[PDB]
Amino acid sequence: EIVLTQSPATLSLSPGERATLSCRASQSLSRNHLAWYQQKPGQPPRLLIHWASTRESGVPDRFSGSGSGTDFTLTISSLQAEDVAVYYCQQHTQNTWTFGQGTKVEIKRTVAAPSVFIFPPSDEQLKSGTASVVCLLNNFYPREAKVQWKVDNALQSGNSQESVTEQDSKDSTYSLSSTLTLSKADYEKHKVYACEVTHQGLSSPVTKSFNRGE
Amino acid sequence: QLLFNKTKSVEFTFCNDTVVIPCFVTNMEAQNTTEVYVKWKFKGRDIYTFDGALNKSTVPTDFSSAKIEVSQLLKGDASLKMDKSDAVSHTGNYTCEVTELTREGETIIELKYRVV
Amino acid sequence: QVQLVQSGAEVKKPGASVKVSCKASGYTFTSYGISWVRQAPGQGLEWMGWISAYNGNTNYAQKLQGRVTMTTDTSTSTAYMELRSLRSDDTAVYYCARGTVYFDYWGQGTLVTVSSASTKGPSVFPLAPGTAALGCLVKDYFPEPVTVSWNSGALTSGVHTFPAVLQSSGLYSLSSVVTVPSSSLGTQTYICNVNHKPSNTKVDKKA
Ligand SMILES: [Zn+2]
Ligand SMILES: [Zn+2]
Ligand SMILES: [Zn+2]
Ligand SMILES: [Zn+2]
Ligand SMILES: [Zn+2]
């Protein structure tokens, strides 16, 4: 049972630069038994290279594979904004098939601070008995960003969920949503609803808040 | 997947100037030699590999004479050819692994040594 | 012209069974193998099994514990994957592929969601406000997917429809937002079009 360890887990390279993706094999492999796959978000995997070096028809020459034995490499010479994907190596040896964990290739850009917005619950959702407060973080890079909810200046824990878009094709930025969920009775019990955002492009955390009833 | 005209054993003596190990794929479909990959195994070690996409042969030190006839590959002939010096020291079961892009197949043939 | 068209997405309860079909065209079906690979949402590819389109011989992933049966129909050039005793672990996108050593052609995938939740339509609520932001909150729906369009596709710049998140009630919820000039608040009217096909839901809401 071959195990394919793939390094690194995540890669952030600027456009035009050279990416080196590794695929270790727990046992020796013949060159015809290693293949590389590209998968963009929401699309089926696309085969790039077979026999560890032979790209498919239509695959650009920027993708080249090499290696033998237990070490194989996929190299992207001039990284493009259309190459943002997860790259998988696959082996087949004597009635065994395995996949590597994959490497997510990311496009690097200049640091951009997020624009933070906050949304009170609709008077109409409160009829259903629950309140949803939404905090929006728009067009920021890098992805790492900490969003914290404070209700009556009390740090919240365990009642908010995050979701993040894929990297934008145009400006290579990210956008994030954070939603705080409360019961109707608990929501009406409090006044100040704040969303504190920490990001590398922000010298100090940014707080967007509202008073319940405005 | 690939099918074969299986031969269990072939044997050689001193008289054989060169020794050939047959390998015949009966259902190959490749229109070009770039789609075929050939590998021979002896004891768990790759002896001869022919990457048709690269037109490259790879043999170890003790199998330098080993090669196949590329001109005959598109007809399914993946037979291994080696000098008898390399044959006598390495006698046993040989595996002929033929790869046609995504398709594959292998067969086991024992090379036997006789004496008169 | 080599194609692998897969059957539509399915929703199943724990313990039930699912069968996914893989209709092949553009090549001699019985001359190749067929492999199955699945992928849980947000995780890596997981090889499931391989089947000979000529023979019917199969090799199954050991961790599937004989819960999977793969068959072919050479009359219709169709491959089938049946997984029984479904559990929440099996919620994934299922793929069929042509090759044996590697896989050079893939189906479009089939989403199989395994949960005890029941199919439900979404509730859409408004998210009201130099630059001003607004959006729609699509909450408490099952199963996925939901599709959000702004002004019937007229407005696309600045539109961010976030990936759905699975809240602890077993239902899905997501938000779709768009940034617009503050001045255009009065001149233009913004509506969101939410389409939840598995419940025949079509909702348009002002924001
Ligand atoms: Zn082999
Ligand atoms: Zn095999
Ligand atoms: Zn033919
Ligand atoms: Zn030796
Ligand atoms: Zn934006």
Author numbering:
A (entry chain L): 1 to 214
B (entry chain A): 19 to 134
C (entry chain H): 1 to 129, 137 to 214
Task: Share the article's original sentences.
CD47 is a ubiquitously expressed transmembrane protein that transmits an antiphagocytic “don’t eat me” signal through binding to its inhibitory receptor signal regulatory protein alpha (SIRPα) on myeloid cells. A wide variety of cancer cells have been found to exploit this mechanism to escape innate immune surveillance through overexpression of CD47. Here, we describe the generation of a pH-dependent anti-CD47 antibody (BC31M4) using antibody phage display technology and a pH-dependent selection strategy. BC31M4 binds to CD47 and blocks the CD47-SIRPα interaction with higher efficiency at acidic-pH than at physiological-pH; accordingly, BC31M4 more potently promotes macrophage phagocytosis of tumor cells at acidic-pH than at physiological-pH in vitro, which still requires the Fc-mediated effector functions.
To understand the structural basis of this pH-dependent binding property, we solved the crystal structure of BC31M5 (Fab form) in complex with the CD47 extracellular domain at pH 6.5 (2.8 Å resolution). Remarkably, only one amino acid is different between these two antibodies: residue 108 in the HCDR3 is threonine (T) in BC31M5 but alanine (A) in BC31M4. The complex structure reveals 15 epitope residues in CD47 at the interaction interface. Most of these residues overlap with the previously reported SIRPα binding sites, suggesting that these antibodies will maximally antagonize the CD47-SIRPα interaction. In addition, residue T108 in the HCDR3 of BC31M5 forms polar contacts with Q1 and T102 of CD47; however, it is expected no similar polar contacts between BC31M4 and CD47 as this residue is A108 in BC31M4. There are three histidine residues (H38, H55, and H107, defined by IMGT numbering) located within the CDRs of the variable region of light chain (VL). The complex structure shows that H38 (LCDR1) and H107 (LCDR3) form electrostatic contacts with E97 and E104 in CD47, respectively. Note that the complex structure shows that H55 and H107 form intra-chain π–contacts with the antibody’s W56 and W116 residues, respectively; similar π–contacts may form with mutant variants bearing aromatic (π–π) or positively charged (cation–π) amino acids. Histidines H38 and H107 in CDRs of the light chain contribute to the pH-dependent binding of BC31M4, which rely largely on their protonation state switch that occurs around pH 6.8. BC31M4 and BC31M5 have only one amino acid (A108 in BC31M4, and T108 in BC31M5) difference, but the pH-dependence of BC31M4 is higher (about 22-fold as examined by SPR) than BC31M5; the weak pH-dependence of BC31M5 is likely due to the strong polar contacts formed by T108, which can apparently compensate for the loss of electrostatic contacts formed by H38 and H107 at physiological-pH, as evidenced by the higher affinity of BC31M5 at pH 7.4.
